[PDB]
Design a protein around this ligand. Structure first.
Ligand SMILES: [Mg+2]
Ligand SMILES: [Mg+2]
Ligand SMILES: [Mg+2]
Lengths: 136, 177, 116, 76, 50
RNA sequence: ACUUACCAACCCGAUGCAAACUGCGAAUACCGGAGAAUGUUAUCACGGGAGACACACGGCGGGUGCUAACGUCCGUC
RNA sequence: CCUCCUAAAGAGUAACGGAGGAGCACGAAGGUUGGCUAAUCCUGGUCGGACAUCAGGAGGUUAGUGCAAUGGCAUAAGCCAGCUUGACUGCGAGCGUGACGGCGCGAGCAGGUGCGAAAGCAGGUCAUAGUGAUCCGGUGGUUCUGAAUGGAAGGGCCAUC
RNA sequence: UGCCUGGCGGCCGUAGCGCGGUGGUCCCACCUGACCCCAUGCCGAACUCAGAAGUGAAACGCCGUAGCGCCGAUGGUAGUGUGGGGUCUCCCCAUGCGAGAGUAGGGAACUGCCAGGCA
């Protein structure tokens, strides 16, 4: 599961998901998977979508993960009043903007890329699309 | 100053024609010889610290500074500013007289002596060395010893390369490797 | 380094006289010669300058720089300063000790009648 | 772990901005370290508080080889 | 607490005294300081550090 | 004295993320000066008498909560 | 009570919001004068290794600063030595910050000193926590008062517990 | 007035570093000597004294070089005041101001007083 091994502080504020993305072009491989919608990707969603494609793109080529969560979300458990400080850390999320390249793949045919990225788009809570590396 | 006069007469004209310098001040020259003694053991007992001071001042001819430690760390068991060694830097007349007494009586009377190492340079043209079993020094009597001690003879040279540092000892004849 | 350690040593004494707006008397010491200049508080111009590389001073000197030469040029700057009338200049040691020719150049100018 | 303390916020910041004519002795900038440095007619306090030493306007300059900020007072 | 209070007593005829604190545990030596006595208007010897 | 299908710090190139990172950097807001127009002094000082100190929701900037609450706590309107 | 963030590029700004820390230490760890420049790494090498101490080179404050954290610090506020007590007294223009009680900065002047040759600097410490209002008394000083007078008791003033 | 050098500045990397070349009549630097004035928390290295035998090496000054640091547009993008609107966790429209990074490119500083040497 993708999570930071060590942080300077345990907790973090809620924040917002405003602004545009900066991960625009594929710069590691030739094929990419770019996010269209807006939302957050939890630690389970990034791990499951990596497992979802890897089944069909068997052991050749190379897959990069362009994002990293670096943001915890705390929860208040059931039958607990409001207050009593901030709750305990449960799972890590990543702030994702429209235009962020999430998943990349190289060393595969283009027809194989269309299949695996379709199989990983259902596991993601936001809409995605297929992109291809353009030079310069 | 027997080797100081020998420097100007023989050593300067030797390196003038060997490495074809345009200026005669481009010759390598000696600056200092720092006679050091890192006694080290003086955490437990302080009586070996004062004895190390008098032994290093017998090899040299003047009073040392008891050296304070570099930086306090816990894994190396030393404290900030702790007296743990003693050194003497010789410049001038004391430097040339000790360098003659180093090479002709102390160095040849080392047992199992085959020669110094010709690759013991720092990388820029300075040479460090040590001589074993300090009974070879004629100043230390065999009855007044407490334990084997230390010394770090380093030749500070204004040369710019190791090859220029090799040729300066060759005129001092540095017996050989 | 040799020269840059002298500059950082004097720098506290340089900018302190800048904060007071007084006229400073800097010195430069050389194994050959010695210099002394009376500087305006802006620092970009001088008013009284006399050294031992000038032939007017070196004729009466056996060697160009010693404690006897610093007494000569210390008076020489001070005599040119009284002809101008800068009258309570400040003394800048400029990174050297106040023991040798820096002291000899200062005490000679104290004898002439400058207020420092 | 057992958090929930905060001190009284000390009233720092710039109290006299540039272009303002101040009196001799007025406090220009309250600060902890030398965020601002003393310059012309500006004294540095014990707690690094920069104050006025002459009647005039506040002038901010960035001088020195280390690119540090200064406060100077020009005569009105 | 551990830190005790002492009074620096003037050695002159005046009974003017200042106040300060010293560590009695590790520093039992009597303090020796010259301070301004506002009565005699001079600097005088101060003693008696407990 | 060398090397092997071994593990691997630092360094270098490429690429992200951070309320408690800033080698960078706004919009406006704020502070001061000058100027015209406008406004029944709208401003400050001082005096007589208060009431109020349970606020609500909506837009926006947030903390908290599940980017749940006609939820809670602030800033601003 | 202190530090940072929440705090939305002035100040101010809440919550059982997020991370810590203080109830001191210090006569030098203060003042002043004179000096001094680390962290890490390479190479060299009687005891000697992972470190005892050094030499030069690379590196130029990532080191250090009695401690929590931030903001500072090379002119070093960092470090060392000599000489010392300004951790002075009576004052204080002007200003910051408070509803208030109050707190904080502050040149300069008067008196007498310390250091330096001198210009100058010094009314504590790199700054921000190290604190208890008042009533009531205890101690020292001061004819200020002295219930008829002269004292005294008590009180006040100042220093202090 | 030119060239070269020193001192104190203005300015604070378009002023730095690295590389290559060069300067010794003067200047500066190293160097010579040191019982002494003094100095070293050891040490004539530094500090400082007395001298000029030697020298442009280290350092410094200048010239040349775009490896690096740095400076840096135009346009575009992100953001935002005011007003309006939507599929209202967010974004668009009208108007005002305009980034950061990156690119083209700039760039081996400039300048003031005074003194010395050469012509
Ligand atoms: Mg010398
Ligand atoms: Mg050269
Ligand atoms: Mg730009």
């Amino acid at each position: 599961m993708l999570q930071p091994k060590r942080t300077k502080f345990r907790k973090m504020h809620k924040g917002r998901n405003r602004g545009l993305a900066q991960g625009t072009d594929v710069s590691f491989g030739s094929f990419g998977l770019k996010a269209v919608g807006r939302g957050r990707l939890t630690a389970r969603q990034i791990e499951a979508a990596r497992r979802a494609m890897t089944r069909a793109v068997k052991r050749q080529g190379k897959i990069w993960i362009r994002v990293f969560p670096d943001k915890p979300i705390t929860e208040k458990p059931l039958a607990v009043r409001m207050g009593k400080g901030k709750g305990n850390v449960e799972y890590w999320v990543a702030l994702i903007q429209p235009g962020k390249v999430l998943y990349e793949m190289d060393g595969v045919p283009e027809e194989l890329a269309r299949e695996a990225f379709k199989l990983a788009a259902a596991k993601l809570p936001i809409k995605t699309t297929f992109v291809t590396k353009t030079v310069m | 100053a027997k080797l100081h006069d020998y420097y100007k007469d023989e050593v300067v004209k030797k390196l003038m024609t060997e490495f074809n310098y345009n200026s005669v001040m481009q010759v390598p020259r000696v600056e200092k010889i720092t006679l050091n003694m890192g006694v080290g053991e003086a955490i437990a007992d302080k009586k070996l610290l004062d004895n190390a001071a008098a032994d290093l001042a017998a090899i040299s001819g003047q009073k040392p500074l008891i050296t304070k430690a570099r930086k306090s760390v816990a894994g190396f068991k030393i404290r900030q500013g702790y007296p743990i060694g003693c050194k003497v830097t010789l410049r001038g007349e004391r430097m040339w007289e000790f360098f003659e007494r180093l090479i002709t009586i102390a160095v040849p009377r080392i047992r199992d002596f085959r020669g110094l190492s010709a690759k013991s340079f720092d990388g820029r043209g300075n040479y460090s060395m040590g001589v074993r079993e300090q009974i070879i020094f004629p100043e230390i009597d065999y009855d007044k010893v407490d334990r084997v001690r230390g010394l770090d003879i380093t030749i500070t040279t204004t040369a710019k390369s190791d090859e220029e540092g090799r040729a300066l000892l060759a005129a001092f004849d540095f017996p050989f490797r | 380094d040799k020269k840059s350690a002298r500059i950082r040593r004097a720098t506290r004494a340089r900018r302190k006289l800048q904060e007071l707006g007084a006229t400073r008397l800097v010195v430069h010491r050389t194994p050959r010669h010695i210099y002394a200049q009376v500087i305006a508080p802006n620092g970009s111009e001088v008013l009284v300058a006399a050294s031992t590389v000038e032939k007017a001073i070196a004729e009466q000197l056996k060697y160009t720089g010693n404690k006897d030469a610093a007494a000569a040029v210390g008076k020489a700057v001070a005599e040119r300063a009284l002809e101008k009338g800068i009258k309570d200049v400040s003394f800048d040691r400029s990174g050297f000790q106040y023991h040798g020719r820096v002291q000899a150049l200062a005490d000679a100018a104290r004898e002439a009648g400058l207020q420092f | 772990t057992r958090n929930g303390r905060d001190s009284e916020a000390k009233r720092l910041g710039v109290k006299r901005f540039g272009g303002e004519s101040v009196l001799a002795g007025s406090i220009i900038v309250r600060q902890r370290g030398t965020k601002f440095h003393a310059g012309a007619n500006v004294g540095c306090g014990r707690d690094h508080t920069l104050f006025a030493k002459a009647d005039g306007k506040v002038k901010f300059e960035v001088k020195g080889p280390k690119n540090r900020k200064f406060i100077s007072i020009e005569a009105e | 607490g551990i830190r005790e209070k002492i009074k620096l007593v003037s050695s002159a005829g005046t009974g003017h005294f200042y106040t300060t604190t010293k560590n009695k545990r590790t520093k039992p030596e009597k303090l020796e300081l010259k301070k301004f006595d506002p009565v005699v208007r001079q600097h005088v010897i101060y003693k008696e550090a407990k």
